[PDB]
Design a protein around this ligand. Structure first.
Ligand SMILES: [Zn+2]
Lengths: 207, 71, 84, 50, 58, 118, 125, 49
RNA sequence: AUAUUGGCGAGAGACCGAUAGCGAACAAGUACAGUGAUGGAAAGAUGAAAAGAACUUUGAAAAGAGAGUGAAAAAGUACGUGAAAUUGUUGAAAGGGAAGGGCAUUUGAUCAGACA
RNA sequence: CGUGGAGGUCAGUGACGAAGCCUAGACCGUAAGGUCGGGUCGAACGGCCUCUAGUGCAGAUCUUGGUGGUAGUAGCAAAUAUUCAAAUGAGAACUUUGAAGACUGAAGUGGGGAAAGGUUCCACGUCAACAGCAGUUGGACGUGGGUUAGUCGAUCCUAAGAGAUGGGGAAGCUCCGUUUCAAAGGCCUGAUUUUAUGCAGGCCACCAUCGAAAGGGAAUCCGGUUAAGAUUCCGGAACCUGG
RNA sequence: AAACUUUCAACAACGGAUCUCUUGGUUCUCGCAUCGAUGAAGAACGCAGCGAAAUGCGAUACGUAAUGUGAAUUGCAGAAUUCCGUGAAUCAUCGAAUCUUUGAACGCACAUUGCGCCCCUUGGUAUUCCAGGGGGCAUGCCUGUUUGAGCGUCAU
């Protein structure tokens, strides 16, 4: 606050006492009157150069740099030695691109979509993402950041009929369209490679 | 208060703050059908008004104290 | 002296209780309260006493009526009985 | 003084009512942390200003 | 001529005069602990008479 | 312990005769309280007194309010207490007054609805 | 995950609305599941509690001890069950508080406006 | 203090500029506010452009 | 279209976690000082449930020692964990007007590699 | 090297005990500091790749809080002064009763008040704190009791003064002024009950209001009485005002 | 040689650091517009079966009535079927009521719980005196009704 420690009228006693020069809360009576205020070092004063609200919260990136980074991450997805080294269990997956048919876009029930992911090989990845539910460390866990999972595979449609309605609920699995391919979704935490499951209507749209 | 009762015929009431020695004398005349010749009020320091009403000789205070039921 | 032998003479009061604000602030030799000027109309409001505005501002006390207008707007200021 | 007004005797009734300990069954309540009575005063130490 | 004492109301509603002594002792101990810790602080910052004299010139 | 759902139906003199019984019974229950620790029964006498006194008051209120039905200035209490602003503002008619130029123009060339399609 | 901006997924805003709930909203917070007999008999998974039910304890050190709901205490968020008794050292007994999620109702105390509470939830008579 | 071979630059910050800044955190709040006022004005006037 | 550090209702945070954050997480603009304008604190954590110690004994009693509750009295309202300055006990050692420190080693204590 | 948070990863560690805390116990790093074993302890917490910052203390006559040495030391010395026996008591230089001894010495260490305090007044019970020693005692602690007015005061007057109105200043909060330059008010009779008045019918030309618990001022004394109340209650004997 | 001082470890103290916790605070965003002479904000006093505060409330006083939920509140004390119901509850909802003495403060005042006025009834023999009750009595200004003032001025 702008008066975070300035709601106290203090003024110093100069020099000629045996005490410090800091502004002291004059008056009398209660246990307060005689403390210091207005300083970064007094108990109950302002902080040093207090944190203001006009910082650089959002920062610009050149648009071609952003389309460069997204096109880099999409190319880093399709190497086996990157998504396996990122931390995803892509061991027993037959094809690194992992194109599925376009019938994934018409699935609607999560029971009928999780089996469709276990069939094409995410059975040792959804187990990885739901055997890894751990508690957040430290003071973050009472600021609505209480749990922490890993990331899972990302299925990318081209026109949805409830594929996002299917896989909103399962942990780790994310959805996206080919327009709005997110760098935050594609290289999460600045590490390249992400176990991306394309549907073929997306994989021929990506051309 | 119960030493003042049998000495004279002197009832001791706690009355309202807004009484003015006439509504006392008119309601204690009413609720008991007794006759009252002197009322002395004071403000006991709990914010209460205590009235030392003296019933007229023609009436005992102990008869009224046993008719009310506080003996 | 000017200290302890001149602190004994302090007996006659110069402030008495005010009838609008209720603190011992009603001056008697000129009849004017200092926490809100009583024979004047408006209360003594001030901008340099920014902490003093919090000691007597709205929302402080009971608000026997002003804590019902917020609820009474939300039902359209409606009248008539509740129901059956 | 002994020749007081009524504005003072209206207040000393509340000053005589607000001079007692906390009732003892308050501490036996469930979510009750009120150990002693803090606003309690007596005439030796803290003069009420009236 | 009383059937009412001090103790007659309070023996029914909660407290008992043996447990009242085990409550009255706890308040006077906690009044000590709240009056100790105020004198643990005010003795430091009380000699600051802001208009002193220092009565020795010549 | 009197109940309003059967207390509404009685007369006025019966309600006065009920209040001047409850006001005696409260006095006797406060006489008995001096020589007894606890008396929880007195609350159901005070709430019965209030339950009679609400019914009497809102009987007489309706007796006045129905007498003033449609008369031009009914009293300050029985008007609908809206805010201070809402009464000193205009009604729905005196806002909807328009002059005979604006009214004739607003019936001569008012708003039409349409689309954009060949 | 939620999909509204009416409801709040905040920890302070949830725990405050729990701990300062009114005594007519604590009724639906204190609920209990029914038995395998009662679920297939009515068709309700869980009802709000009501005093003088007949209940069974399924979690805690008093598991298996059936009893009768003596007084639901929705200020300490619990319910004292008869025949769930801690012997105090003074020779007296106290009933031990249970939380109603850890109970299971076996013989129910029916009533009107419970024979409506079942049928609005889709049960039998 | 005119220190080095740097451009002589004027900054209009003598005043109490701290009390009057408006950092627009609204920039994505009053866009979805505007794209609803272009829907209430699409439903209230029903077939008109 | 615009403004809004006030009131009302909401939703969130790469913010702070009780000497921080509003002065106030608590019966806070309260307790308290001043004639007065105004100034203005400290203070959250037993346990899952009080199951807060029945009973015996010493003592005038405060309490102690058993016994008991407890998963835990190394959780007994002075109640989570219990740091340091500071202090008692016992143990080790040393000491002719300071104590502490550096390099080397005797003696005394303790630790050790396995080369099983 | 380390600290508070944030994005990944270790499908990390953990009630079979996570952080923290202690250890002239061990190891690694020249160090910044890391790692292990033991005791206590009871619910969370690290490594690596990155991001971010209210991020590293011996000091600032530093701020808040705590505790030392000095130290069982300085001292607890004005106001003439205490002593014996008994009583309750666990206990008595200190409480009470008696017996002595004194002092204040009528401008009192007496009996009542005014300011101010506010329940301290008085009884019952009690000693953790306070009474700079003590304590069964107390102006402290807990709970209850107590203030009675036609006359004694305020209320009613006016002083020094304060302050609206008519007005006039002032952007204005408000300022001047107190009878001024206001059209400022109230009541007997023919009317006498239509009390409305037609005139009768006029009489200064006045004027808000506050301002003394010591000025002015209508009238009460005695004798009882209570744990505590008086010119107040009780008994008797008097008055003054309005009707 | 003990005592003593100093160093260390265990155990105990003083002390409240650290760790972990959080119904609070801060900042950002979104929506809505509602104080008051029908007496507001603010204040004094008072109200519970046993409360000194916080909260609530007005002589109808931790509250009344209506509506909804449908079996409690709880520290103790009490009513208990009012429990297949005109119905528990420190509940929620809130549209009808009271709303003490005040406060812009409104009959005149105020360091006073002071002092009159007018009407309607009640008692005291009672137009006048007293008392109880009920409702009235402020200024500035607007529109209108009524009553007047002015060789200002017109007609007769
Ligand atoms: Zn004031």
């Amino acid at each position: 606050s702008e008066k975070a420690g300035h709601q106290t009228s203090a003024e110093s006693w100069g020099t000629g006492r045996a005490v410090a020069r800091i502004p002291r809360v004059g008056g009398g009576g209660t246990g307060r009157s005689g403390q210091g205020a207005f300083g970064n070092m007094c108990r109950g004063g302002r902080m040093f150069a207090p944190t203001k609200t006009w910082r650089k919260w959002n920062v610009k990136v050149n648009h071609n740099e952003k389309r460069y980074a997204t096109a880099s991450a999409i190319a880093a997805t399709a190497v086996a030695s990157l998504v396996l080294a990122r931390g995803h269990r892509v061991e027993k997956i037959p094809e690194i691109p992992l194109v599925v048919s376009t019938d994934l876009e018409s699935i609607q029930k999560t029971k009928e979509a999780v089996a469709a992911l276990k069939a094409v090989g995410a059975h040792s990845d959804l187990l990885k993402v739901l055997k890894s539910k751990k508690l957040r460390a430290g003071k973050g866990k009472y600021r609505n950041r209480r749990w922490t999972q890993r990331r899972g595979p990302l299925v990318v449609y081209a026109e949805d009929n409830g594929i996002v309605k299917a896989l909103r609920n399962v942990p780790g699995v994310e959805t996206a369209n080919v327009a709005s391919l997110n760098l935050l979704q594609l290289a999460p935490g600045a590490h390249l490679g992400r176990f991306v499951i394309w549907t073929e209507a997306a994989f021929t749209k990506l051309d | 208060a119960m030493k003042k009762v049998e000495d004279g015929n002197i009832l001791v009431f706690q009355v309202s703050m807004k009484a003015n020695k006439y509504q006392i004398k008119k309601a204690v005349k009413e609720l008991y059908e007794v006759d009252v010749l002197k009322v002395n009020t004071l403000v006991r320091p709990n914010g209460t008004k205590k009235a030392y009403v003296r019933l007229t000789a023609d009436y005992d205070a102990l008869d009224i104290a046993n008719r009310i039921g506080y003996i | 002296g000017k200290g302890t032998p001149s602190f004994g003479k302090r007996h006659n009061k110069s402030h008495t209780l005010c009838n609008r604000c209720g603190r011992r602030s009603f001056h008697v030799q000129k009849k004017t309260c200092s926490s809100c000027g009583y024979p004047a109309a408006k209360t003594r409001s001030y901008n340099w006493g920014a902490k003093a505005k919090r000691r007597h501002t709205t929302g402080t006390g009971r608000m026997r009526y002003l804590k019902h207008v917020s609820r009474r707007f939300k039902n359209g200021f409606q009248t008539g009985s509740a129901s059956k | 003084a002994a020749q007081k007004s009524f504005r003072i005797k209206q207040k000393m009734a509340k000053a005589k009512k607000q001079n007692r300990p906390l009732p003892q069954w308050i501490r036996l309540r469930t979510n009750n942390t009120i150990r002693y009575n803090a606003k309690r005063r007596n005439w030796r130490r803290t003069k009420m200003n009236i | 001529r009383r059937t009412i004492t001090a103790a007659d109301r309070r023996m029914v509603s909660g407290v008992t005069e043996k447990q009242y002594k085990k409550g009255m002792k706890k308040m006077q101990q906690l009044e000590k602990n709240a009056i100790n810790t105020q004198i643990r602080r005010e003795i430091k910052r009380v000699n600051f008479q802001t208009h002193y004299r220092d009565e020795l010139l010549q | 312990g009197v109940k309003a759902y059967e207390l509404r139906t009685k007369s006025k003199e019966q309600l006065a005769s009920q209040l001047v019984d409850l006001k005696k019974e409260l006095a006797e229950l406060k006489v008995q309280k001096l020589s007894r620790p606890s008396l929880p029964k007195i609350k159901t006498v005070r709430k019965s007194i209030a339950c009679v006194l609400t019914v009497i008051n809102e009987q007489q209120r309706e007796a006045v309010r129905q007498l003033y039905k449609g008369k031009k200035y009914q009293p300050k209490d029985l008007r609908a207490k809206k805010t201070r602003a809402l009464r000193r503002a205009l009604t729905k008619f005196e806002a909807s007054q328009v002059t005979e130029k604006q009214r004739k123009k607003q019936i001569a060339f008012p708003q039409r609805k349409y689309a954009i399609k060949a | 995950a939620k999909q509204s901006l009416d409801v709040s997924s905040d920890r302070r805003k949830a725990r405050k609305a729990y701990f300062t709930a009114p005594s007519s909203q604590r009724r639906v917070l204190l609920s209990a599941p029914l038995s395998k007999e009662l679920r297939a008999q009515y068709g309700i998974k869980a009802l709000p509690i009501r005093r003088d039910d007949e209940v069974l304890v399924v979690r805690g050190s008093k598991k298996g001890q059936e009893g009768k709901i003596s007084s639901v205490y929705r200020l300490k968020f619990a319910v004292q069950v008869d025949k769930v008794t801690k012997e105090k050292v003074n020779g007296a007994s106290v009933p031990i508080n249970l939380h109603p999620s850890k109970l299971v109702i076996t013989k129910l105390h029916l009533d009107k406006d419970r024979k409506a509470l079942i049928q609005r939830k889709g049960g039998k008579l | 203090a005119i220190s080095k071979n740097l451009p002589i630059l004027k900054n209009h910050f003598r005043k109490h500029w701290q009390e009057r800044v408006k950092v627009h955190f609204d920039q994505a709040g009053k866009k979805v506010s505007r794209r609803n006022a272009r829907a209430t004005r699409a439903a209230k006037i029903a077939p008109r452009p």
